[PDB]
């Protein structure tokens, strides 16, 4: 058992049929010593008598708010949450696996640039009795400072017969060095509580690995002489790091109507020449030129 926050404790339960659970001793936070009784949650059945209560925690039914009373009045609260482990695996019910990039990816973080600002996302089908808590830092031994905002609902879509809710957090490294070569990774740690079910998640990454520039800016076309060719032109996105002579980008351009495996062409220049067809569209992405991080989304125009 360990303290999560003031008067809130977590019990680690390795559950299986006929498991014994964990023996937990609670102590009423009082100078008094006699005439003390104990309850659980909102029931008025007395469970024990004395300044200390010993319980065998072996299910969620044994968790909740234990309260001690003396002389008909309340003295102290203690809320027990459970971190359920089953066959050597911590529960992960609250968050949904996004499976991008890797399996077992519950927190997904991206950065629009090297400034040190990044955003993490996660998914849940729960809408009530849900609490999150997010801290972050660079390095684990002597950690540097990373301040994060509050997690809030950002989106909400459909997942068959369930609504899927999306939370997000803005984070910023206290002292960033956009040009430097990172040696220690960012650590993001999220605690989640749903009713009496505690869980936590983690994510490690270098900014350079999670970088996803915004789509190319000001994408435009213009006809050429004779043959049905077009000149595609675009610019760097505003959110991208600056100067652009130092933080260079690569671009991918493709035609696609409606087996367009050959329509793609790559270039470091900010415009290209392509061939258009009826009702086909031209679209372009952007990627860091010198480090194969993530591609941006598409920026498209009709032919």
């Amino acid at each position, epitope marked *: 058992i360990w303290e999560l926050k003031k008067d809130v404790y977590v019990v680690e339960l390795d559950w*299986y*049929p006929d498991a014994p659970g964990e023996m937990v001793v609670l102590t009423c936070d009082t100078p008094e010593e006699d005439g003390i009784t104990w309850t659980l949650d909102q029931s008025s059945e007395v469970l024990g008598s004395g300044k200390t209560l010993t319980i065998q925690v072996k*299910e*969620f*039914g044994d968790a909740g708010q234990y309260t001690c009373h003396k002389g008909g009045e309340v003295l102290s609260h203690s809320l027990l949450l459970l971190h359920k482990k089953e066959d050597g695996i911590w529960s992960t*019910d609250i968050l949904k696996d996004q499976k991008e990039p890797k399996n077992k990816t519950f927190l997904r973080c991206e950065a629009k640039n090297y400034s040190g600002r990044f955003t993490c996302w996660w998914l849940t089908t729960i809408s009530t009795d849900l609490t999150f808590s997010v801290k972050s830092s660079r390095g684990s031994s002597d950690p540097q400072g990373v301040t994060c905002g509050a997690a809030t609902l950002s989106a909400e879509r459909v997942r068959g*017969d369930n609504k899927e809710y999306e939370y997000s957090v803005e984070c910023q490294e206290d002292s960033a060095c956009p040009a430097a070569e990172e040696s220690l990774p960012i650590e993001v740690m999220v605690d989640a509580v749903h*009713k*009496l*079910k505690y869980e936590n998640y983690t994510s490690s990454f270098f900014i350079r690995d999670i970088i996803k520039p915004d789509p190319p800016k000001n994408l435009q076309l213009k006809p050429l002489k004779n043959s049905r060719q077009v000149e595609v032109s675009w610019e760097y996105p505003d959110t991208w790091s600056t100067p652009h002579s130092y933080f260079s980008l690569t671009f991918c351009v493709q035609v696609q109507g409606k087996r367009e495996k050959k329509d793609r062409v790559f270039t470091d220049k900010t415009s290209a020449t392509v061939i258009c067809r009826k009702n086909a569209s031209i679209s372009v992405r952007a990627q860091d030129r010198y480090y194969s991080s993530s591609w941006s989304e598409w920026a498209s125009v009709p032919c």
Partner: nanobody
Amino acid sequence: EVQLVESGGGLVQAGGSLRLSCAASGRTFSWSAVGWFRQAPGKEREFVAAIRWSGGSPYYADSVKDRFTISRDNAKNTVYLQMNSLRPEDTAVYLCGETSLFPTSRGSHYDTWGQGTQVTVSS
């Protein structure tokens, strides 16, 4: 809103056996679980057994493990309670409920309930 409907109850004689069923309209969460409670006359409803839709070992009450076995059928979306070797002390209303905190024996942790089916065992 999930809906739960019990059935299979009735009047059997000591040593007999019934199979109750709890037909659910769906699942609040992928990890939701369905549990059987039993409400004898005069007393409060006591936990019997519970099982997750996603499988794994169920969670039985201290005693019933030998006589009672709980099973599921994801296709029909129904949970079964096979009761064997019944005694007159088993007479009660058998209710079924859905929970998001498997394993749990506490009623207040089950968010949705059926109206229950009557089981009467006569010596």
